[PDB]
Prior knowledge:
Chain C: It is found in: Mitochondrion. The first copy, chain A, is α+β, with helices and mostly antiparallel strands.
Amino acid sequence: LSRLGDLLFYTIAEGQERIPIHKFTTALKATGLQTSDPRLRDCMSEMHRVVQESSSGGLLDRDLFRKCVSSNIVLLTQAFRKKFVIPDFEEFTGHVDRIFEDVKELTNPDLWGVSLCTVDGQRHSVGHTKIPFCLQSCVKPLTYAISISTLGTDYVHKFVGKEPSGLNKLSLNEEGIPHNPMVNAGAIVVSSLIKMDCNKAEKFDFVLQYLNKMAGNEYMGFSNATFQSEKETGDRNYAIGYYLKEKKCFPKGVDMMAALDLYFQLCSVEVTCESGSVMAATLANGGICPITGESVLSAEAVRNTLSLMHSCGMYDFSGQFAFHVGLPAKSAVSGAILLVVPNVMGMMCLSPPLDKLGNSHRGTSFCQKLVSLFNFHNYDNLRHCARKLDPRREGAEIRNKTVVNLLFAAYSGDVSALRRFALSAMDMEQKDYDSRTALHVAAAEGHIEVVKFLIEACKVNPFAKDRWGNIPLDDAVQFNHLEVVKLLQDYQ
Amino acid sequence: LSRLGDLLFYTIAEGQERIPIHKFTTALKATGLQTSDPRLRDCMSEMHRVVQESSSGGLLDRDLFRKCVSSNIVLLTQAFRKKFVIPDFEEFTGHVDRIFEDVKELTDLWGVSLCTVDGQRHSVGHTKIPFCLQSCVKPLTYAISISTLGTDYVHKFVGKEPSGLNKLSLNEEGIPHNPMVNAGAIVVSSLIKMDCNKAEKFDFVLQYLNKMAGNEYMGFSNATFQSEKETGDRNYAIGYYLKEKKCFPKGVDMMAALDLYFQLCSVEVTCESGSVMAATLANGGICPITGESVLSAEAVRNTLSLMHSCGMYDFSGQFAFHVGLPAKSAVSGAILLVVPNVMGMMCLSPPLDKLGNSHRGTSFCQKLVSLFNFHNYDNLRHCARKLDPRREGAEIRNKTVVNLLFAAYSGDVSALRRFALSAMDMEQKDYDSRTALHVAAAEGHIEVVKFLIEACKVNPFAKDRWGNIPLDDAVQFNHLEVVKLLQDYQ
Amino acid sequence: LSRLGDLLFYTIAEGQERIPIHKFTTALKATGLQTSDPRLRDCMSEMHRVVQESSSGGLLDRDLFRKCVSSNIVLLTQAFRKKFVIPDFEEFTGHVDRIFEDVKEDLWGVSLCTVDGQRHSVGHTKIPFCLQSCVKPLTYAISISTLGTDYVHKFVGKEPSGLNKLSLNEEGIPHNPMVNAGAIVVSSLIKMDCNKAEKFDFVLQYLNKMAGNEYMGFSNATFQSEKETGDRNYAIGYYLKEKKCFPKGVDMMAALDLYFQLCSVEVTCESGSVMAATLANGGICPITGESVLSAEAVRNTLSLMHSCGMYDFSGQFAFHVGLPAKSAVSGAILLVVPNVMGMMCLSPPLDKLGNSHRGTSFCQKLVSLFNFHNYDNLRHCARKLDPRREGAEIRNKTVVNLLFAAYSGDVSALRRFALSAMDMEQKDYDSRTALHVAAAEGHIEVVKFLIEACKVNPFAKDRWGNIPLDDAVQFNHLEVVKLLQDYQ
Amino acid sequence: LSRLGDLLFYTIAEGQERIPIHKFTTALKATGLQTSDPRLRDCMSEMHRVVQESSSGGLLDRDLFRKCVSSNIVLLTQAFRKKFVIPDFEEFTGHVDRIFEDVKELTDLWGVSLCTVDGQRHSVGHTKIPFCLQSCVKPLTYAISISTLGTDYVHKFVGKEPSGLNKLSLNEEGIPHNPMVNAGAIVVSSLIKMDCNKAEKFDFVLQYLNKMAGNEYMGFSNATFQSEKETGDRNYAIGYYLKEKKCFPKGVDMMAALDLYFQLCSVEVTCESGSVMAATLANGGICPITGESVLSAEAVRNTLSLMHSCGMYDFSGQFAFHVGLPAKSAVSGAILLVVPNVMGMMCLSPPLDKLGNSHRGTSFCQKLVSLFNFHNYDNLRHCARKLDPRREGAEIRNKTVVNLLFAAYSGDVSALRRFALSAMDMEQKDYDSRTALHVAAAEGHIEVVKFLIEACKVNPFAKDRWGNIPLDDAVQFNHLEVVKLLQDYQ
């Protein structure tokens, strides 16, 4: 079949047929795809092989490119066709950069970093993003997602609730189970449901097996210093664990200290921001890892977890986060916040300083400045973006589209449609590709019934100069009609 | 001369030379839009006037058909291009009737209505029966307050988080928990323009509700206005407590403010009018069917966030999990529901459950979101077993002629190269009857014109109604270099 | 029938056989009874009649007593016989005066009425003040007696709240009559078929007998107020209306209105002190002896007044003071010392917990010095004084048993005194000790224990100058002399 | 001289010259005191010593009776003068057995024991069966802490007021609610001498409980000490939380604390031994039957105030109202009762109520207080329908010979005049063969002598043991005025 691989090369090769692979590496990082991306592992392999077989020793041509690429071409076109979920990435990251650099004033204070992974695998990172940190209680949804997928939607919720507590605060819901999996009592109970017929060592690696697919096989360590600690200092969880033992809310035939010990292992799992960003991007992508395409979690599992981060993710501040930011998140005592922008991207941030409610100061400030500028809120309308940008669509696409539809209804007499653009505060002064406007477009025919609304209602300035410098008065003379001309002399 | 405008006759007529009028109404009935649509009255009036007077009588020819449908081509092409949010409306509602009969088995007055953000309406069951907005005006009242006053001012007198486990409870700030309970509904109702009498105050809010509703039916039932003022024991109890704590603003009478909340609760609507108000919240503060900016952007966002969390009283938490759509219920048996960026809905079933929410309504909503991929945190792309009627497929952001002409204006050849990969045809013409070539020729971009003539094999002999050859336009701009290259083609 | 009336005159008249009645007034105020006492009403009319008729012009002899004095003799002897519940009253009030003046370091007063009718007042006790929420126990007592214990508590609880405070108990009724919700409900249980004017006087009828017909005013300025400002109670009343916790066929606005009348009832400290002495007694007023309240009405009111009476000191007051009390925003506290006395205090300055500063400080200093706490042991008073018994009563009694046990050779009993921290160096009327008693009888085992265990000082000198060694010469016993010679 | 001990023979013997021993056993059994009473052992030994080593055997003559009882007359006379707090003991317990049978029809271990503050003991039912003080040691532990440490120190680490909210929490200051719930019981156990090992810690408290009990039976059941350490999930949950919040003092570990608290909870007593510990709280920190100052005055006051409100778990509010006595219950089925200044009591019945109190034991307490005036706010004098065996009406402050002698010493004639009003004879005498006149004669008060000689006609020449006529003392003191007045009689 005459596959479009040659067409891909033509877009890449603006000039001669012989292009270096070094030039192919750039314009692939422009789309925010790293050279080391797993999704294109089978592509870069043959590119390095050709250094010896080819006489030119590096200068790729059109024919050789087709053979190396394969059924994965569909993903390869999408990157250069700008059909990912965030085109104009170079500008998008630049705005993520200015937000990041702005909050430096807001007070290891030097530790300050944020990373992000788009649902299409596109990614960017700024600041100290490669300093590992523990997922201190950030693994509660990860554990809950693993349990709910493998066991069933009802089984996991016979033993823990699905709605917040409203007040730490060791207590149970009305039914006799912990309020939600986002608190210690629920996180401990759900942790005890995973692989109940296995030992401590085997259970931990099975859960950790689900990680590194959630994380796309970036770094995932199991630190011991945090594991030895928090077992001597885990009095809060010992109190919860014994309380949960007393209230008999564990499953039948389950050890309690063993369940606690596994829970302490998970909290000690150490990740960087880059690996953290790729994590929860699989949550955005509905249980399928973006950076590799592996189906990690079930469809319901990623639905249930995201609703719970919205409710209980940020502890006491969850109510305000659900209002000012309206994104699922999960915070840690380490000073790092997990963030999910469903259908768009996943993001993780790091700043050690922490505010009174268990959340980072810079981290929460960053999430606020972000949603305020990029239409990310859950109930922000996608069509009427207002001053907020929509990275889901390439820049100026909506701005140019509105003009073309506005100018379209010249001669058929669609008077009514003009009202909605005007009454929606849409600017009538926008100039199209040829410097035309609905006033210029309609003023050519000289039928007063249409242009009458524009002057009377919109009060639009008719003194604008087109690219040719001609005024509609000359156009009317060019079309042999004088009646409309009388109205034109008015307004001054 | 003939172009995409004309196909409206061909697609409806199947090429038939003359069509009956009832075909157009039946065809237009599909795709959702109703004959009485505020944006289609021109066609209805223009249809009856000429047809009954013209000698042609009950037959529509091409010239006759074009002018009658000429008034609303932007909507009619949108409806017939299937550019609406739900282009499978004939079958999307076909699902809704089977679910409607399904909830009958579980448990006389049962009706549901819907209205998409593009104005597509459907209704089944007793949807015309009026009923009182007992509690559904709480978001609507709160939305009005945000727009004129603001979120910072409105929330000094009320919180923004669920209360949980129940009156006479306040947050740590000394204000009611949120505007979605009786306590918070009173305080926001008091905030609305405390400088005019009660009667004018009611009509101000009633004016918004009609604009939010888009001028469909509304009522002000006095048989519930008085029957509550003589029975609102809990409301009176709440009101007295608020003024003790100085919760109301300065210079506000509790009895007047507490009477206004009673006036609004007594407003009467149907499923049809209510669904449009819901669809006004889905559409970001613009009526789907009349296109006015009734509300501010920040108002509807705050309204939906609180409707999601605090909407359904005690069942709010479970509803945000199984269904995840902002909603609001009332003792009358009606559930308001908002699907952001998609549609709005309203149900009605007088029987209720122990938690104060309608059983058929909540049964219907659960059976809906489980099938149509509408949950807030359900994902696009990976629909799983759920149907996704928001798009037949491909992309709603596919190739268009607009990006070319502005790409030519800006000199972004790379975008043109990206468009070239999609086997895009350059022959699609707007008013210009010109491809991207002229704009680059006018600008003088040397690389763009060379790319277009060679890479795409564009016709240089394209005519235009304005009567100027592309070479002539370049002459005024002194693009001498462009002249030589273009002339070399022949 | 040789009645003991003439014996009363002899103790009253230490001198000649004809005494002026002016001297009878004094020594009747020393016992803390006022000349205006209702119990001796008939006496006052009779005494003044013969002051003018008698040729002596006031002098009173024995023969008059047997005729004019009457059934009130049994009470009249009780005052001079010191058989009331608080003898040595002149010293007792001096300490209450001491506490009063001490807490000072402009309106400040306290009054007290003993359960036997005895009474004292100091400060600004005569300035009237409203009875704001101090009527809550009084209305509950009136309601609980007339209706029944089961009826009144179908509609209000008997439990505290420990938390304004708008909520109901688990059963669906307000927690207790000591809160506004419970206080308003009990108000609605009184005289179902009567009107606002008739109900209020029937309740006020009880209050007048409660106070022994002392001043009972119904101010209007506070009644007009608290109906405009009663939003808290309107909120409660409508709340109680909504919850349907009122009795069948009862209007809510009227029940609220009656409640506002009671709070506006105005009393002085003197009148308020006689109040809380009726229910210090078992529903019998001391100053009149009339049965005001039922037996199982003062038991319930005091139990609830202890639990819930004070507002936020309730837990601490039941610990540091342990007395039923009720406080008001006016700055006045009602006190009950069951079986002892009633009491009321006044100081406007009110602390952050809704209770008076000087008032609560006074109750602290009082109970700390006078054995009034509920679980203070009566027999082992420690450093706390006991007004129930006259001074030097137990102290002298312990000496006699300590010295008498020595005579019997009761060595075992002597262990209890010493090991109970009691001072064994106590001197009797004639300066003897147990060592002296044992020395006389020659109980060798007794004297040995005192020297070894008690370490008694042998330097004690009797009034005659005799030393225990000298008594040996009187009776000529040798064996104990050798033991006595030791220890020095 | 005629010592009062002879009257004890006459009243027991009814004037009979010779008494059998078995008569005395029943006679002393009445008035409450048991043969094994620590304060009556000397009489019992001397009673048995002569009987088994004399020809007379089991018979007591007057001289034999006087010398044997001489060591214990002050308590034996108290028992036979009916000076005990319950002089009607033979019938007071006769009531207790009928109530005992009446409650013994509800739904078997059922036993009750009592001990008065004067050491009168009675028991009925299975009172000898031991059981563990599961929760009843909470007041006892708290009392020990107050005495050595103080109320200010002990309550820095625990509040002093109930909770009403089983519920791991803290009142308002980062400390447990009260020492009567499991959370507060643990903190006080940690406060007791945190400078020595666990085992010595247990025996220090056990030493107090022996003295509070007065040396009756106690046990240390290890089958409950271990069975709670391997099952005390609630206690471990509470303990872990306390150290997180730094509620324990400095230099304390939760490991030791729960070990001690389970040791104390596992101490074993019977109804008899427990009742005396209760009666030790009645008598203000002194054992009734042995007279040791085990506790401080402020310790038992604080203990009883907290036992009143917090003693029962959730039935306490309804218990402080219907019964009003300080009490304490345990899962074993035993209720500890303290009737201040009267007696202590302990019950035992395994089956419980919904709130963890014994059904057959709690009904008995209500049926008791309803009949015997013991409610904290029942009134003396006006007993209503309730029996009052405390003093059956009489004045405890009745006239005595002691007041005359000390009144004579101080010269307060008015007190003597008050005594004279009662027609009482001033010839009542102490051991020393001296009436009030001798004391007055020694002092030389002129007015007192005139009152005594005439108001009562008392002999002034009565002989005395000390062997000197009072006139001779006056002659020694040169009270010439007294001489002539005294001589005027002859």
